[PDB]
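User: Can you write out an input/output pair for a complex, sequences first and structure second?

Assistant: Here is one pair. Inputs:
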Amino acid sequence: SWGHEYVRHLAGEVAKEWQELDDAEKAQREPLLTLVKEIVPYNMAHNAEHEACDLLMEIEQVDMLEKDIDENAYSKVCLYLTSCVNYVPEPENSALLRCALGVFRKFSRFPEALRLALMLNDMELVEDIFTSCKDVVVQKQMAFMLGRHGVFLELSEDVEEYEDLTEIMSNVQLNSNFLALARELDIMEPKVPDDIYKTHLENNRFGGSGSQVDSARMNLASSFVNGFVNAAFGQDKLLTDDGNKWLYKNKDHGMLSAAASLGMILLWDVDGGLTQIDKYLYSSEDYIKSGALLACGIVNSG
Amino acid sequence: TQCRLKLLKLERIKDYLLMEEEFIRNQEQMKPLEEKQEEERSKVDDLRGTPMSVGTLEEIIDDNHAIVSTSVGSEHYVSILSFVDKDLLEPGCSVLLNHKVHAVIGVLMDDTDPLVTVMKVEKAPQETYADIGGLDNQIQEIKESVELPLTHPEYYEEMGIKPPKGVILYGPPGTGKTLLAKAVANQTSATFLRVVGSELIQKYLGDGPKLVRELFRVAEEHAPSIVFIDEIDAIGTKRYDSNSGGEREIQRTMLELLNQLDGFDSRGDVKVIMATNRIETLDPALIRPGRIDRKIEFPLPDEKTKKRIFQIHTSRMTLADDVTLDDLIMAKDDLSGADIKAICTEAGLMALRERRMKVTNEDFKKSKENVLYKKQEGTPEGLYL
Amino acid sequence: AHHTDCTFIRVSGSELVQKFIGEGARMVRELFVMAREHAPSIIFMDEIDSIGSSRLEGGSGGDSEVQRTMLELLNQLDGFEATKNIKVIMATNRIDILDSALLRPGRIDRKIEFPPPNEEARLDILKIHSRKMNLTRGINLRKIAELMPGASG
Amino acid sequence: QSTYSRQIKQVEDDIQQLLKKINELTGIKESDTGLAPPALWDLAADKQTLQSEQPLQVARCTKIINADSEDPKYIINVKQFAKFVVDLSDQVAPTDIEEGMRVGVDRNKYQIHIPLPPKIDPTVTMMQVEEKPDVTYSDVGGCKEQIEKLREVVETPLLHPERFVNLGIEPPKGVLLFGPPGTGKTLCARAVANRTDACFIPVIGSELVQKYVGEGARMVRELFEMARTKKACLIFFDEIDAIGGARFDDGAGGDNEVQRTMLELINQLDGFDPRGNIKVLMATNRPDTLDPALMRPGRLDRKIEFSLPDLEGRTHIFKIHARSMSVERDIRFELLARLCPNSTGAEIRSVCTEAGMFAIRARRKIATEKDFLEAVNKVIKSYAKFSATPRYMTYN
Amino acid sequence: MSYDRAITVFSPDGHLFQVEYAQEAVKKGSTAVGVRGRDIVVLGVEKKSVAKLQDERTVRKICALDDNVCMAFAVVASVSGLTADARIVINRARVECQSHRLTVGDPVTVEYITRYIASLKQRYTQSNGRRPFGISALIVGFDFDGTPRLYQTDPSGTYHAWKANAIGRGAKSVREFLEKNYTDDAIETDDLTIKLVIKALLEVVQSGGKNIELAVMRRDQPLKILSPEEIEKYVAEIEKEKEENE
Amino acid sequence: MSRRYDSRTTIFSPEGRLYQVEYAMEAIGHAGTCLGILANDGVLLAAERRNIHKLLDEVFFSEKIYKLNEDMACSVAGITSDANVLTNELRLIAQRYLLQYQEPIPCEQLVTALCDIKQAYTQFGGKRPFGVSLLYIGWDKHYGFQLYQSDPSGNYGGWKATCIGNNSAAAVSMLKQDYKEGEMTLKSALALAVKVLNKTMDVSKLSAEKVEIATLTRENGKTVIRVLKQKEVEQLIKKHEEEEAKAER
Amino acid sequence: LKVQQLLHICSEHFDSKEKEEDKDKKEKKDKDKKEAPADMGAHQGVAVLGIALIAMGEEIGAEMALRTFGHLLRYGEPTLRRAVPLALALISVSNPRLNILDTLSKFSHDADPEVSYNSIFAMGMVGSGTNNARLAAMLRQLAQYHAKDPNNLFMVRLAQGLTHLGKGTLTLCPYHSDRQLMSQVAVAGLLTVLVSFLDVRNIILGKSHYVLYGLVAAMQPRMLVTFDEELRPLPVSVRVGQAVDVVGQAGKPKTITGFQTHTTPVLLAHGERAELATEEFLPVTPILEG
């Protein structure tokens, strides 16, 4: 009977018959969590209450240090939430994310907290969490690096600059604490990410340039492939530098597009790469000039 | 575990929606208003009478005529009377014929015979790697050959190694030959064909070899597919003898299977998982390496391997957790993988005999002995003679 | 069969027992379909293993070949691995004298030993039979039980 | 656990009902395929449907003799196992209906629209047949003694037949091939053929097993006739341990078809036979059942025992495959070949496959030297297992 | 009678049937491990097949053939716990050893008895009607020189010296296991030598250390069988360290 | 295997493991039970003789329990024909031991001498294996009263309670169960001997025609071995009989 | 989500009127991108069957369904690569239709000789045996070149690489280019950004030590469905810690393993496919082969 004993206990609570407001508002749930982790997401998910998430919140926050260590406590909660979200209908889903955000706020490990702030994409929520990621240890160590890399990396932008919704608010705060101006901002901005891309490129190997033919309708295709394949640092550098060949021969809206696609390759460079984009801006027809701005945007996300 | 249970909540909603959604799309709301669409539905009703006869298309000629064998009466030289083109058709397929005038109305059914019905266990098992009682390394050999080229060609092309056309499993028996075949088959989520070797042996003249080649044809239409030839030795090199109509039969069904798998080269049309309980005392005429490349041999579990089979098992069970898994294995002597499974099952049943509900440390000890005894009586014991 | 609440359908270990549309060796699948439908059922797989001598010693053989497949479908198809509402009762006369197909693990998990008769047994069995058949004059059932036990029942 | 359990019971009932629906889901519509032009087609089809004179049945004349008071009748036999007589609805002539010729006849007039090519057996077998080979010695497992002995049969009489004719000898054309599977017996035969610059046709005896009893002999006879037609070619019979193989005169099995086929095959060969650089090879994949008639020397000139590639021949073929894929060069393959017993060319190629795969498991993209060791261990043991107790046979 | 049945037939295997087959028996019943030490070469057995109403004096699974050479065995065959086959081999090998002393003095060397025993099984392959003994003995001993030796014989009769070798309950398995435990430190220290033996035995532990019987033997000196009670002292402590590695 | 490579013992097994010995063990079970129990002033042997028939000449009282020596006796379970060569052999060995050692021969020494002949027959010389298990009962001054069990193969063990014959498995466990140690006496071991002999055997009556009982008892420091005569045997049976009778209906 | 995602009336109009988003919608992409590791495979399981339903339901339906189904693969990131890559390839040989190559190549960026093996062959064969126009040629080349870019370079995943339970990048931009003809010249400006990339970073960090090429981890890449997708998968499997970027979506499972080395993960696998985060008690983070 003993092996089964832990699961049946928590399996029974899932039902949550009659009273739904409990009598305790911490529930009997707490000792069972440490022993069995499988039963628990079944309970939160079927229950599909914000109240369910309240009971789970109080017990994980205390349990963090005391029961065993911080590291296992952190692990137990992340799994539980994951089953539960699918089962909850959308108006209520936002409420559970915030409730979870509080359990994490205290915790030494931030990862799951950032996901919850991302889902919402709220200005205020993301600010609160960020300041909290850095605060635990004033030394750079896990705390600052975890917060900075994890929140910033997250996507919401097709261009490689990731979020940047967080970026302006979070940065002023990080330089103020002072571990250096250059370190906080360098990680925070896309500059560090430009290097790590470069190094990975070699191992993976490259499909060659996106050039095919510079004559006929094929010149339009050539233009488009360069943009699609690489939104980062290429190895197709040699074709883009030489603007005159690819970019000009282009017809109709493809001219604008050729000029855009060139910015994708130049993205992760702006310490010399900027100058051509500006030549294109001054000169010629509207399609090319407008293309150069779109492209500038792309480069100035580096 | 948790994940497996969750998939079921989505699937419960899915059945309900799919049955309603089917209705609007299939027709009677997408009722043919299109010249192409209406023409096929209306024309086949008019040509068709009832009854009809099934046939299998023996060969086609490129002048819009073909030769078929109908189930009833003679064969017919039929024309392609409307509908399907030449390309669509292939020999070895089953096609539908009107009795009024035998002609190929079409196939889109991937055949239809009573034979195909037995072959298609098409809907996958829930059995999957590490739901098996198996050895970690042994399943991962079956996967490497059969499964992996389809899933990632990447590793095989860079490395520069040749993809096989099947594999072969052979005993010492009681090693989960069949369990392995079912585990891989679920993972591909490709149609799983199955036939037992004795069905292919018969005392009728010539029927057997049609079925053996037929397995590869049915599979090809469905393809990708994995074709499970259960107990290959049965058609092959294990006796039906020379005095029951085996004398002709075995040699033909065995030979027929052996030549296509071999071809003239390793064809690589459809993958095969072949299970045999031995090739140990049986005669040569079976598929050799370098057409099916890797041939997988099973051991007889040692102490170290027994850890991997046992840990999987102890989870469904209980109160062998209290006592260390390592010590339990050490104590027991060497036995085959079915035997190990049998001890564990028997532990659950013997508690019920004791007047207890389920496995205890004591029940687990006794079950080990009982199986061991069967084997020790059956075959040689300890110290020399 | 009475206790378990099953329909006793005795199943031959033969599969040349069909010639209805073809041999049983060929049509192993039909036996299965019927078995399922008339569930619960007990399929009594009677192969005494005192038929065959070289078949018993070896692994191969025609009888062995056909028998092996009928058993393998029981596992592959399941419904003796999802359920056991239908019990496969094998019968042999000894612990070990079995044919290779029947013997091996994974189509066995139990073997049961019953003694031959004794005076005490002979009393019980004789009594029950005596009443049905015709009871003797003044009762001497006890005498016959004491004197010697029955060879079989 | 508990909450889920009820969902399990309900879902099963759901799946049952759904299994019927897949039929409908695929289409309610009775149609297979159809485009706007088969509408035109259809008007014509209608008449053919209407009339019972069509469809046309396939029948085959077994022999020509009848022409009894009407333009030639013959006995044509439909596949419902009933004989019928033919009349004209095109023509009838000695040449329109022949000994082998199949015919198209009506269900309820039995008149000939068209004759069809003689026999079912030569059209189907044509797909199976491959033409001139392009394979070479390195691929068989290098230069083997068995290879050189094939040259003597194939290459010498074919290239220069004029020397054998002048001398007074007939040239040798026959070989009996025997040994275990995987040696590369067909592969070797093909190898010599390519250099010699002669056609090759595979014939598989098992692939045609169209029977109505004694029918099997007519197929043997046809496959032989076709080989003979192509001069400067080699015919290789695969899988002839049955239907054209061992008799059963001790039988109690209801066979006579293997015996019938054997009868015809020995007879055609024996005495003389009309050939002109058609090499006849026989491959026997069965040690258990052998046909003595064919097996002894004579018209089929030599017997060669087919043996696995020698030590130099296996090293050489491995080298060729090894370079193609990623391998470390200085390769330990030589140390392993010498250590181990005789290993075939098929076997060595599986080593390369298996070594690649171990290497992927380790998480390298180079298959290293360690990987080749595990791959040889696996292959040698698998080959080794088969027994059929040969001593028992030697005794009797 | 058949060709295969006969004792004469060198078989496609390329080696005589009865010699081959005796070699496939050296796993199962009983277990014998012997490791080499400077001051004691020690053999230990597990399973003397004793119900503990059966005399342990009668069954010798560790018998001293000389006064500086001893051997422990295991083997596979029909009918468990089989004293007989092993027992003839003890009787001829021990007398021969005593006869050797009489002919050419002092305690006889480890390597010589092992050479005699391997050849004893070999000569039988020529001799009429006779198959070789399926036994592998771990000949454990010290030479007259005092050079410690650990020797092992096989069923065909080829012998090799080793530093440490284990047989029975799967020979290959116990040999492999013993190689993780063996170290050059183990040979120098008197406590570790005993534990090395016990450490191979335990992966098929049965019934205490009272089941397990060890002997130490010294340079010219008789077999000293350590008490069934002493052995237990090592097992309780060691068994815990054992669980962790496998 | 799939065929034995035995049909002679001048040719050997297809596994090198001897089947014939397992058939020999089965042979003891075919034949009637032999049991030995230990006592604190003797040892006794109880065996079921081949003869059950009423007509017995009865010149012999020893027809399965043979007194070999002036210190030891043995019994047979198995074929009677085999004992006759063995019994005369055992007499030679038993007196051979005395000649050199002149000591109350130990049970372990006599058994090892015999095991040499049984192991050779199975290995070579073309002689068929034995089918008897013999129980040796004797006294030495260095451990006491002893009982040994010998097997057809040459396999031996010292016991102080052992039984073989009429399903060995059941019988040895049962003989042990009812045996007690250091609580015993010769009369009570003998009364008990019939009781256990009764249970393993199909008969619930048993007579001196069916059974033959021997004592080995040490008197004035020397061992006197006798196989008992029928009237004496009957008295041990009747002692048991009252109890057996109550079990019955 | 899933319930909405089958809802159809399409036998009135083929405009936007009653026609609606329905054929396009049938993929069930929005969730797969957003949330859960399990859900992504289950919905695709539904999806396979849906292809037939549109295809058989109308001839017109088949043409539109084939384009959007090819996008599910990129938007959703399924663990299935069986049916759909091959299906598209075979139909395009039969019927010239240029949209098919384009939608497929967007999938083919993800891991470029898993899926790309098939696609490259099909796209080349059609390209050089069929051309209808210069315009037609232009599409087929664009797809053919876009398709290869060896093994997971600037790979597409709709992860964050810290989790995939979060809100991914704007997927709707390739979805826009895929629904309508890519032959439309007006489209071109929007067309240039349809990227939906996820980092090629697998750098270990989350602590200051800043070593390149992270810890040992577990993966099974001989799979198309897997046992553990609870949240974090099995941490045994077959070991991987190589420098080359991870090959997901038929060897998706990564468990982060680090306990044996005595450092512990701050980031447990939450759907991540990029950078590891750990709290390192070591000055140099070990690197392994596997």
